[PDB]
Design a protein around this ligand. Structure first.
Ligand SMILES: CCCCCCCCCCCCCCCC(=O)OC[C@H](COP(=O)(O)OCCN)OC(=O)CCCCCCCCCCCCCCC
Ligand SMILES: CC(C)CCC[C@@H](C)[C@H]1CC[C@H]2[C@@H]3CC=C4C[C@@H](O)CC[C@]4(C)[C@H]3CC[C@]12C
Ligand SMILES: CC(C)CCC[C@@H](C)[C@H]1CC[C@H]2[C@@H]3CC=C4C[C@@H](O)CC[C@]4(C)[C@H]3CC[C@]12C
Ligand SMILES: CC(C)CCC[C@@H](C)[C@H]1CC[C@H]2[C@@H]3CC=C4C[C@@H](O)CC[C@]4(C)[C@H]3CC[C@]12C
Ligand SMILES: CCCCn1ccc(N2CCC(c3ccccc3)CC2)c(Cl)c1=O
Lengths: 299, 124, 62
C-alpha cells in the first residue's frame, strides 16, 4: 500500500521491501519519504500535504464557560456599584471627596472586565493590537486613580496629574505598538505537528515586561499606601486603599511565576490572564466600595 | 474521613511507565492527587466558618480582635492553592516539580499564617 | 548498534535498516522488544534499568 509506506530495493530492481516511514512525511517520489511544511498534514493518497485549518483557537467551550460567567457577574456587580454611586451618593458629602476619580476608576474596572472578552476572542492583528494596548491602558487608569486617591489623603490639579500619568503610559504603549502591532503568525510545536495553534505571536516576554512596568507602578502605589495608612483622611479609607494595594500586590506576585511556568500551554495562557484580571477587579471593587454601600444603606 | 478514604485504598507504590517516554521510568504513590478532594472541601468549609466567625468578632477590643489578620490568611491560602493548581496541571513532570511545588506552597502557607497571626504579637 | 540486517532477496548481501531504538533484545537478524521498564542497553544483548525518584539530598531541586 502507498499509505505513507515506501519501498527499498535490497540488491535488485525486481525485489523490493516495503517499510513505513514517518506518518508526517509524504511521498515526493515512489522511493522517497520527505517532510513537508509545518502545520500541514499528509493527505491519504500520500502525494501532497494539505494545510490543516487553524481550528485550535480559544473557541467557546467548557473551558470558555467560566471566564464569560465571571465577566457577566463582574459586569452586574460594577453596574450595581455605579448605579448606587450615581443614585444615593451624588448629593451627599460621602462621595463628594472623590466623585469623578471614583467614576473614572469604575470605568477602568469596567474596561478591565471587558478585557477578558478581548482575551477570549480569536486572534487577529487588529484585535491583538487592541488587546495589547488595553492591557496597559485599563490597569494604568485603575492604579493612577488609586495613586491619586492615596495622594489626596486641588481636585482639578489631581485630575490633571492623573491624566498626565495616564497619558505617559498611553504614549509608551503607543510606541510599543508602533514597534510591532500585528504579531500574527503561525505557531509550530515540536513532536506535535498534528495540532497547529493559531495565536498572536507577540512576545509573551514582551507582554511580561509591559506588565512588570505596570507592576513597578503597582509597587509605587502600594508603598505610598503603606506610608500614608497611618493617618486616616477622616473617612477611614486610607487603610482600605492600603489593604487593596497589598491584595493586588499578592495577586500580581502570584500571577508572575505561574505565567512564567505555564507559558507553554496556550489554553492556560487564555485562562490565567482572565482569572487574574477578574480576581483583581473583584477584590478592588469589594475592598473599596462594599463598606461605602454598607454605610450608605445603614444611613 | 481521610482514614475512611485511606482504608478503602492501600499503599501501592510502584514503577510507572509512559508511552511517550520509555527511556525513563519513575515510581510514585498509587493514589491520584485528586483523592484528597474531600479533605480539600472540608478545609474550605472550615475556612468559610472561620471567616464567618471572624465577621462576628468585629466589634471586639484590639487584644481580642483579629478580623484584620486572619481574613488575609484565608485569602492568601486560597490564592496560593488556586495558583498551585494550574502549575500542577501544566507541569506533569512527576520526577521533581510536583514535590518542589507542594513543599514550597506548604512552607509559604505556614510562613504567612505565622506572620499574619503571631508576628504582630511578637512585635508588641 | 540499533541496526538490524535482513537479507530476504539473497544471501550475498543484506540491506540493513535501523529499527525502533527501544527494541534491542536479539540484534542479530531482527530486533525484538523487551519488558516494560527495562531499557535494552546492557552488554549490547540485555536489558537493564536504574531506580528513580531518589533525589533526596539533591543539589538540583532539594
Ligand atoms: C473574588 C476574590 C476576592 C474578593 C474580595 C476579597 C475580600 C478582601 C481580600 C483580603 C481580605 C482583607 C479584608 C479587607 C480588610 C478591611 O478593609 O476590613 C476588614 C473587614 C472587617 O474588619 P473591620 O471592619 O473591623 O476593619 C478592620 C480595619 N483594619 O473584613 C472582615 O474581616 C470580615 C470577615 C471576612 C469576610 C471576607 C473575607 C474573604 C477572605 C476569603 C474569601 C474567599 C475568596 C477566594 C478568592 C480566590
Ligand atoms: C471558593 C470559590 C470562590 C473559588 C472560585 C474559583 C474560580 C474563580 C476558578 C478557580 C479555578 C477555576 C477552574 C480551573 C479549571 C477548570 C477546568 C476547565 O475544564 C473548566 C473550568 C474549571 C473547572 C475552572 C472553573 C473556575 C475556577 C474554579
Ligand atoms: C505565593 C505564590 C507566589 C505561590 C505560587 C505557586 C508556587 C508553587 C510557585 C511560586 C514560584 C514558582 C516557581 C518559579 C520558577 C520555577 C522555575 C521553572 O523552571 C520550574 C518551576 C518553578 C520552580 C516554579 C514552581 C512553582 C512555584 C514555586
Ligand atoms: C467570594 C466572592 C463571591 C467575593 C465575596 C466578597 C465579599 C463576601 C466581601 C469582600 C469585601 C468584604 C467587605 C470588606 C469590608 C467591610 C467593612 C466592615 O466594617 C464590614 C464588612 C465589610 C462590608 C466586608 C463584607 C464582606 C465583603 C463584601
Ligand atoms: C483552602 C484549604 C487549604 C488546605 N489544603 C490545600 C490543598 C490540599 N490538597 C488536596 C488536593 C490538591 C490537588 C488536587 C487535585 C489537583 C491538584 C491539587 C493538592 C493538595 C489539602 Cl488536602 C488541604 O487541606
Amino acid at each position: 500500500a502507498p499509505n505513507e509506506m515506501k519501498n527499498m530495493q535490497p540488491g535488485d530492481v525486481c525485489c523490493w521491501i516495503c517499510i513505513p516511514c514517518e506518518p508526517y512525511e509524504y511521498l515526493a517520489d515512489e522511493f522517497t519519504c520527505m517532510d513537508c511544511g509545518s502545520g500541514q498534514w499528509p493527505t491519504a493518497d500520500l502525494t501532497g500535504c494539505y494545510d490543516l485549518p487553524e481550528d485550535y483557537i480559544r473557541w467557546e467551550d467548557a473551558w470558555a464557560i467560566g471566564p464569560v460567567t465571571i465577566a457577566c457577574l463582574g459586569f452586574m456587580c460594577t453596574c450595581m456599584v455605579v448605579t448606587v454611586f450615581i443614585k444615593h451618593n451624588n448629593t451627599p458629602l460621602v462621595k463628594a471627596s472623590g466623585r469623578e476619580l471614583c467614576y473614572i476608576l469604575l470605568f477602568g474596572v469596567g474596561l478591565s472586565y471587558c478585557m477578558t472578552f478581548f482575551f477570549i476572542a480569536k486572534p487577529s492583528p487588529v484585535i491583538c493590537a487592541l488587546r495589547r494596548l488595553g492591557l496597559g491602558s485599563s490597569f494604568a487608569i485603575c492604579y493612577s486613580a488609586l495613586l491619586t486617591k492615596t495622594n489626596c489623603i486641588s481636585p482639578s490639579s489631581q485630575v490633571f496629574i492623573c491624566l498626565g500619568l495616564i497619558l505617559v503610559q498611553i504614549v509608551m504603549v503607543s510606541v510599543w505598538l508602533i514597534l510591532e502591532a500585528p504579531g500574527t503568525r503561525r505557531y509550530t510545536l515540536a513532536e506535535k505537528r498534528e495540532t497547529v495553534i493559531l495565536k498572536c505571536n507577540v512576545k509573551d516576554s514582551s507582554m511580561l515586561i509591559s506588565l512588570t512596568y505596570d507592576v513597578i507602578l503597582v509597587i509605587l502605589c502600594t508603598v505610598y499606601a503603606f506610608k500614608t495608612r497611618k493617618c486616616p483622611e477622616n473617612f477611614n479609607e486610607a487603610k482600605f486603599i492600603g489593604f487593596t494595594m497589598y491584595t493586588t500586590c499578592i495577586i500580581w506576585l502570584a500571577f508572575l511565576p505561574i505565567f512564567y511556568v505555564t507559558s507553554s500551554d496556550y489554553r492556560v495562557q487564555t485562562t490565567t490572564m482572565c482569572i487574574s484580571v477578574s480576581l483583581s477587579g473583584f477584590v478592588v471593587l469589594g475592598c473599596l466600595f462594599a463598606p461605602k454601600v454598607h454605610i450608605i444603606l445603614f444611613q | 474521613i481521610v482514614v475512611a478514604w485511606l482504608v478503602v485504598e492501600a499503599p501501592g507504590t510502584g514503577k510507572e511507565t509512559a508511552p511517550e517516554r520509555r527511556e525513563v521510568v519513575t515510581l510514585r504513590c498509587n493514589h491520584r492527587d485528586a483523592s484528597m478532594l474531600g479533605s480539600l472541601a472540608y478545609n474550605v468549609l472550615l475556612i468559610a466558618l472561620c471567616t464567618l466567625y471572624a465577621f462576628k468578632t468585629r466589634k471586639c477590643p484590639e487584644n481580642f480582635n483579629e478580623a484584620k489578620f486572619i481574613g488575609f490568611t484565608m485569602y492568601t491560602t486560597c490564592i496560593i492553592w488556586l495558583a498551585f493548581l494550574p502549575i500542577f496541571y501544566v507541569t506533569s513532570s512527576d520526577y521533581r516539580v510536583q514535590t518542589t511545588t507542594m513543599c514550597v506552597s506548604v512552607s509559604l502557607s505556614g510562613s504567612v499564617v505565622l506572620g499574619c497571626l503571631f508576628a504582630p504579637k511578637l512585635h508588641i | 548498534n540499533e541496526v538490524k540486517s535482513v537479507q530476504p532477496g539473497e544471501v550475498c548481501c543484506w540491506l540493513c535498516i535501523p529499527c525502533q531504538p527501544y527494541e534491542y533484545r536479539l540484534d542479530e537478524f531482527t530486533c525484538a522488544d523487551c519488558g516494560l521498564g527495562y531499557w535494552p542497553n546492557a552488554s549490547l544483548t540485555g536489558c537493564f534499568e536504574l531506580p528513580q525518584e531518589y533525589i533526596r539530598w539533591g543539589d538540583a531541586w532539594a
